[PDB]
């Protein structure tokens, strides 16, 4: 998260860290046994870490739980990045510092303020990964401007959020993390153009379009 | 020769550690891969990297 602020210990209870020997992506706890993240974060040997603040030191509130299953959306396209969504089933249920986030009843409109969180790089031009969780409030942008920022790259399953001025954005290590608006999970950190550039807002997976697939997939697995 | 190409992080925002052959140093090094649109000078292990590009 470039240009954000320290959320505060366990103030974003649904935020999880995907660990494969090191933090490589974020994710959101949608129920005691399921996590939602991005499809490009698919990896074998995933360990989900919950109740985390400082990802570098054990502080007691943690629960490390291996993934039993990883379901990448059947239509995910690695070239176009369309349908960048994945569900991870925990090997055992988490003990609900640790809480789930609600799925959206409806899609959010441009102008909506949302909270983006993650342990990604905090420098636009450089590298600095934080110990603690970073937060960022950013508004959802119109489909028109999003499409203007990325000609022929935005699909109906993506939305832009951020600032045209630059300086506030998601960055390397934030992928799969939550974009929560009005208490509902509306987006998944997905891609962008560098970090915090500017006229290049970040692109997020539009969660409201997957609610049915998510609910049915969780139930039959 | 893709082995002479510089490492490509790509547009995605994951922080996945991969390997690339650094022809200047004559060895495989680590870099951060974003998770999508990998180019060929991107390996999962140093052995894979050395086997494919070693001595390029
Ligand atoms: Ca910790």
PDB file of N, CA, C and O and ligand atoms in Angstrom, chain A residues 51-60 62 64, ligand 1:
ATOM      1  N   UNK A  51      -5.319 -13.327  11.958  1.00  0.00           N
ATOM      2  CA  UNK A  51      -5.051 -12.597  13.187  1.00  0.00           C
ATOM      3  C   UNK A  51      -3.665 -11.980  13.198  1.00  0.00           C
ATOM      4  O   UNK A  51      -3.022 -11.852  14.247  1.00  0.00           O
ATOM      5  N   UNK A  52      -3.188 -11.619  12.011  1.00  0.00           N
ATOM      6  CA  UNK A  52      -1.866 -11.030  11.856  1.00  0.00           C
ATOM      7  C   UNK A  52      -1.858  -9.512  11.843  1.00  0.00           C
ATOM      8  O   UNK A  52      -2.790  -8.867  11.362  1.00  0.00           O
ATOM      9  N   UNK A  53      -0.799  -8.951  12.413  1.00  0.00           N
ATOM     10  CA  UNK A  53      -0.571  -7.518  12.356  1.00  0.00           C
ATOM     11  C   UNK A  53       0.868  -7.429  11.858  1.00  0.00           C
ATOM     12  O   UNK A  53       1.099  -7.222  10.669  1.00  0.00           O
ATOM     13  N   UNK A  54       1.829  -7.642  12.748  1.00  0.00           N
ATOM     14  CA  UNK A  54       3.226  -7.643  12.345  1.00  0.00           C
ATOM     15  C   UNK A  54       3.474  -9.046  11.794  1.00  0.00           C
ATOM     16  O   UNK A  54       3.617  -9.991  12.564  1.00  0.00           O
ATOM     17  N   UNK A  55       3.521  -9.190  10.475  1.00  0.00           N
ATOM     18  CA  UNK A  55       3.734 -10.501   9.857  1.00  0.00           C
ATOM     19  C   UNK A  55       5.104 -11.118  10.108  1.00  0.00           C
ATOM     20  O   UNK A  55       5.363 -12.253   9.703  1.00  0.00           O
ATOM     21  N   UNK A  56       6.003 -10.350  10.713  1.00  0.00           N
ATOM     22  CA  UNK A  56       7.346 -10.843  10.968  1.00  0.00           C
ATOM     23  C   UNK A  56       7.582 -11.409  12.357  1.00  0.00           C
ATOM     24  O   UNK A  56       8.568 -12.102  12.566  1.00  0.00           O
ATOM     25  N   UNK A  57       6.717 -11.115  13.322  1.00  0.00           N
ATOM     26  CA  UNK A  57       6.925 -11.681  14.648  1.00  0.00           C
ATOM     27  C   UNK A  57       5.630 -12.259  15.179  1.00  0.00           C
ATOM     28  O   UNK A  57       4.557 -11.701  14.968  1.00  0.00           O
ATOM     29  N   UNK A  58       5.735 -13.382  15.878  1.00  0.00           N
ATOM     30  CA  UNK A  58       4.569 -14.031  16.450  1.00  0.00           C
ATOM     31  C   UNK A  58       4.149 -13.233  17.678  1.00  0.00           C
ATOM     32  O   UNK A  58       4.944 -13.013  18.583  1.00  0.00           O
ATOM     33  N   UNK A  59       2.905 -12.772  17.685  1.00  0.00           N
ATOM     34  CA  UNK A  59       2.378 -11.957  18.769  1.00  0.00           C
ATOM     35  C   UNK A  59       1.215 -12.592  19.529  1.00  0.00           C
ATOM     36  O   UNK A  59       0.526 -11.912  20.295  1.00  0.00           O
ATOM     37  N   UNK A  60       0.965 -13.876  19.288  1.00  0.00           N
ATOM     38  CA  UNK A  60      -0.114 -14.550  19.988  1.00  0.00           C
ATOM     39  C   UNK A  60      -1.477 -14.668  19.322  1.00  0.00           C
ATOM     40  O   UNK A  60      -2.072 -15.746  19.345  1.00  0.00           O
ATOM     41  N   UNK A  62      -2.297 -14.999  16.303  1.00  0.00           N
ATOM     42  CA  UNK A  62      -2.280 -15.743  15.041  1.00  0.00           C
ATOM     43  C   UNK A  62      -2.861 -17.147  15.014  1.00  0.00           C
ATOM     44  O   UNK A  62      -2.943 -17.833  16.028  1.00  0.00           O
ATOM     45  N   UNK A  64      -2.280 -20.157  12.037  1.00  0.00           N
ATOM     46  CA  UNK A  64      -1.715 -20.528  10.749  1.00  0.00           C
ATOM     47  C   UNK A  64      -2.491 -21.770  10.353  1.00  0.00           C
ATOM     48  O   UNK A  64      -2.575 -22.719  11.134  1.00  0.00           O
TER      49      UNK A  64
HETATM   50 CA1  LIG C   1       2.539 -11.938  13.650  1.00  0.00          CA
END
